[PDB]
From a paper:
Serotypes A, B and E are the main BoNT associated with human botulism. These neurotoxins specifically target presynaptic motoneurons via a dual-receptor binding mechanism, which involves membrane-anchored gangliosides and a protein receptor.
Complete movies were collected on a Titan Krios microscope, resulting in EM maps at 3.6 and 3.7Å average resolution for [name] and BoNT/E, respectively, although local resolution varied significantly. Here, [name] also presents a linear arrangement of its three domains, whereas the BoNT/E map shows it retained its more compact domain organisation, thus alleviating reservation that this singular domain organisation among BoNTs may have been experimental artefacts. Our structures are of inactive variants of the toxins presenting dual mutations at the catalytic site (BoNT/B1 E231Q/H234Y and BoNT/E1 E213Q/H216Y). A similar set of mutations (i.e., HQxxY) in BoNT/A was previously shown to prevent binding of the catalytic Zn2+ ion, which is also not visible in either of the two maps presented here. In the cryo-EM map of [name], the belt is well-ordered except for a small surface-exposed α-helix (residues 487–495), whereas in BoNT/E, a section could not be modelled due to the lack of map for residues 499–515, which forms a random coil in the crystal structure. For [name], the lack of density in some areas, particularly the HCC subdomain, suggests that the preferred particle orientation observed in the angular distribution map is the main reason affecting map quality and resolution, although local dynamism of the domain cannot be excluded. Since HC/B has been well defined by X-ray crystallography, it was fully included in the deposited coordinates associated with the map. Although the crystal structures of [name] and BoNT/E were used to produce the cryo-EM models some differences were observed when comparing the output from both methods, with direct superposition showing root mean square deviations of 1.9 Å (over 1218 paired residues) and 2.0 Å (over 1197 paired residues) for types B and E, respectively. For example, overall superposition with [name] results in a nearly perfect overlap of the translocation domains, whilst the core secondary structure of LC appears shifted by approximately 1.5 Å, with some of the larger loops deviating more significantly.
Numbering used by the authors: 1 to 1291
Write the structure that this text describes.
Amino acid sequence: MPVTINNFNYNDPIDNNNIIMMEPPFARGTGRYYKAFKITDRIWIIPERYTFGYKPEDFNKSSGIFNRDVCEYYDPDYLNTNDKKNIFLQTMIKLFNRIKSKPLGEKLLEMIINGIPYLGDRRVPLEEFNTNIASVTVNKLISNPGEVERKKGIFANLIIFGPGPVLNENETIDIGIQNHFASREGFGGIMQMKFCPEYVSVFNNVQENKGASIFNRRGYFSDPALILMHQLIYVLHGLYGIKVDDLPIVPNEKKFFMQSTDAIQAEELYTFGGQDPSIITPSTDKSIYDKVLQNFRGIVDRLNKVLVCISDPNININIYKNKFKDKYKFVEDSEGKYSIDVESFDKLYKSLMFGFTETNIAENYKIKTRASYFSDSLPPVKIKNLLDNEIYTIEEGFNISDKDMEKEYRGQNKAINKQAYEEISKEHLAVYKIQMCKSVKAPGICIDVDNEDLFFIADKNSFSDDLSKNERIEYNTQSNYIENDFPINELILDTDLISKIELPSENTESLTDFNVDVPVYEKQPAIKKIFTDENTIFQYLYSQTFPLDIRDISLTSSFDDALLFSNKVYSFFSMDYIKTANKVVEAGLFAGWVKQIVNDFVIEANKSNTMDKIADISLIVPYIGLALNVGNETAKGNFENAFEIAGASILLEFIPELLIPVVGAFLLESYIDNKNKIIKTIDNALTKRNEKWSDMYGLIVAQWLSTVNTQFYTIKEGMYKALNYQAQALEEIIKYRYNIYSEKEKSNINIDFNDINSKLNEGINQAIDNINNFINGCSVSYLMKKMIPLAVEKLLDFDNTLKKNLLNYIDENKLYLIGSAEYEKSKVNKYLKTIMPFDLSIYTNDTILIEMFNKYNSEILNNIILNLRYKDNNLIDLSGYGAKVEVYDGVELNDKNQFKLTSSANSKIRVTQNQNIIFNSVFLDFSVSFWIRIPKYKNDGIQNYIHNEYTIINCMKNNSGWKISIRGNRIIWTLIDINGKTKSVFFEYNIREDISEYINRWFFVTITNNLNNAKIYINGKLESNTDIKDIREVIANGEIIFKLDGDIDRTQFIWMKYFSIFNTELSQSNIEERYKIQSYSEYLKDFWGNPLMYNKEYYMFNAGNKNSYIKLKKDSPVGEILTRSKYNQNSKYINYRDLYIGEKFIIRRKSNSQSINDDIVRKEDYIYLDFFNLNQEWRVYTYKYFKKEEMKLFLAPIYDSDEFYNTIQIKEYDEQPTYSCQLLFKKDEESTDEIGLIGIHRFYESGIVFEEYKDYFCISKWYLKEVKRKPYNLKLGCNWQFIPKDEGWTE
């Protein structure tokens, strides 16, 4: 039969059957009875204020509190009269009907009703049903008081009292005697409950978006009749007796900003559900499991031993034995002897522990609840009337589809309903506050902070170290890993407990001994003063807030001034924003000023890709340090620089000390002489090692989740608060500016505040989205980088020791006992090689962590191993792992990451790596990318060109590795194989073809090998490929040393720019992006790729013609174009074109010619390109009003016209990187429109000597298409390459 609610009023006469006057167990024998109603059998409601342990004066509000976590509300005038008691009882009936509606409520019930507590705790022999114990029975009055008093015994399972002296507090107390509890040792007892239906908690969410664009009423409130099932699941645990006590999670209190909280056991963590039960280590899980199993076996022994009761003759035997067997799910043998089935007990334990939880109940009932135990909270709000059927419907609840609210959880939104659910005045709320004040005796600055805002950091005393126990293993031992996931189909298969037997009656004899212990509660002070000077969130969020009674303010960027003056506020935005906000305008431009300041606020709050630079950083929020200052004072300096040089470890202000004990070795002393069972022991040892790997990973994950995410969530909450405060301050300032003036401007220009409020809220929402994404990525990066390697090191050492021990054992015993051994030698040599990969999907289930972990792992810029970059005249790895580099300050290098390597031993770079990261078993898969410049041959050393072999990059550690060699016109990549053979990759440049653009030029090279193929990229394309299909099984273990390692001529020096080695697959669509990112630059390029320089000798080169230059004759000053020649010296071995030809285009200025001062780079600079010929000065001239066609520029004598603007402009006209420039001679400065397009014209120049047929490159309207469609300009007369002279190139 389904559970049935009995409906009746409060003034009904005492029937002594359904409305009795019992005595609560904690009342002992005082003699003050209480009326009590029953809803369902063994579920007694008793409406009255809980007064067992509290003083009568305790109820009124005082300066004290009870517990240091929750915020409390006092009220003495609750449940005063019969009307209030009747309303309480009606609300209880309504809530129970709401619970009974859904099938899951019926499953939760019918389980705390049919579960009868065992008769008698351990202080009784194994053959007695000692009914006279305070944890079983209570006494009820039969006769009307005054002449005759009788007491009869009545059973119970749950007694629901009223609220305590604090309405918010709800608890489920149990019964225990002489400091020993029968509710934990598999027995169970009657339990009480405290409750109040009206008041409910108010929570909030961050990731999601609120329905309304307002923060006056924000968040949600918890639905009544769902707080109740939390207490009922606690009651079910206590009643079934599995409320085992074990290691708590103590909050650390060794610092001045730590949270103070009472210890919390696993009972409060196993029922809240979600990701919280994952901070409970599997060792503690198995310990609890074993304790529960042992207790149940003990009760099996007691139940099989008991045979007669000597207290109440009315009690039967066989029916009670059958009922207890049904309750505990035992197995009855044909001889009447009970037992325990391991699978049945495991199923029961999982169903009772993981099967029911608050998150699952909320998801089933479609009710909004919090995300985790460690989360935000808000002051509570009451409900005006829970009985009015227009507000709360027992079929749906707060989400009535009639009023169009069953969507997006609209029913429980505080802002949208806003009318039927009053708030609670803060004139009676008492909270635990901490007063943080400066070291000075009287600073005038003493800040208050709630205890609910500080950082919660766990302590290392709360994590067990069962890994270090010496383990004995034999062929009969298999260890089962207990899961932490509940399939909801268990209850479906159970199907409403059809097989349960009807419970026996509740009429037994009365009790005699009623001695039982009762708790005593005491108040605490609510003020705690500490002296601190380390500025943090608690010191910035207060300075960002202005007093309520002030009217006019003015933002400023001085935190010291913000603390000193209450008039000003602190703003971490830009100085232009501060100036705009401080500006004062007139009535004419008020609307324009308002729009401008709102747009500026939105743009300033929306920033995600600041300082787009070649560096490998995806996203960053550049005002977190300026707004919060969390860590080692990240506010000062550059947050971007600090992040890029310190990794993700700079935000946190307390680095946890990990607990990674060394795991104990195995004791495989089974000593089986025959029956070849040693293989079973070996396999069991391997499985046990796997389980220990899993346990260590779980421990690391639990500690991470307990500390790091908590601190980062506090950071995110502070960010939300700061942004909201800034928006509110801006709106208040705008309102004051509007209100300052008289009615004239109000009538002339009209504006409403709702539009600007909505715009500001939208901006805040977008900014919070970006900040949340950044913080989540940072947290996952820290987890994957700074914690796992230590664990994998410890497990690798343990694996080595275990392999040695197993090898010694097998050699000493089994090698002689059994001939066949090579199979298990191969097993112990191969299986113990590969490590178990990490995977968060096994140790966590909720999508919030998994999705961002997957995104981080899919990201390609988070897989750097050996990020080599220049930073402060030193080489520091930017990968974040931390590698030791040995260099001195004597050497001098350019800032833009330039390395020069030669045969001299003076230049020495030593790198020691932390190659203990999760290893790559397959290997044969990586990439190496770098930028090279190589010298040129000087027609000397044919042996050097042909025979010589040299290299600068190598990895030779265990006589098998890989290296990259460079020859004269060759690129080689050699890898070694354990067998003896070697595979090599060859590439070369054509030099007899007379076409070359790589020689003495920067060139990007990438080598990428996978299991299938090894590929070479030099320009983003494939030219030469060869197969590496052979399985090499050679892994790079040692260091890589950068040196030629050969004493040769000093004339050779190799230039290197950017070394990056990836252990990740780089197949395609990433190499080209890397090329573009690392080659993109604002400045201009030389012939080879160096920055364009001033006062540098230059010569003409264009891709249109291979032989053209400008030369001025030594005898006579005439400049013109002649054809180029080859090298004058004859050399049949090799030949090349001539380069050091023509006249220089030096930028010589008489005012500043030597020691030019550092200037400021500006786009489209005004540069004059004129050269000097000894004492003759030339002038570049063009006839302003030219009427001819194809007219050359004039090299004229000196003219006294310099104030006129005949400047030359330089730019680019192609998207992809190149080595060329675009020159322009703009005669009119304000020519905002295009004067003309490109024109290549065949021209018969009117030369006196001869009519030269040239291809002149002028501004003509005959080739509009090229520079109108704007492709990548590679071939044109608009190249104008500037080729300097340097000692690297020998004439």
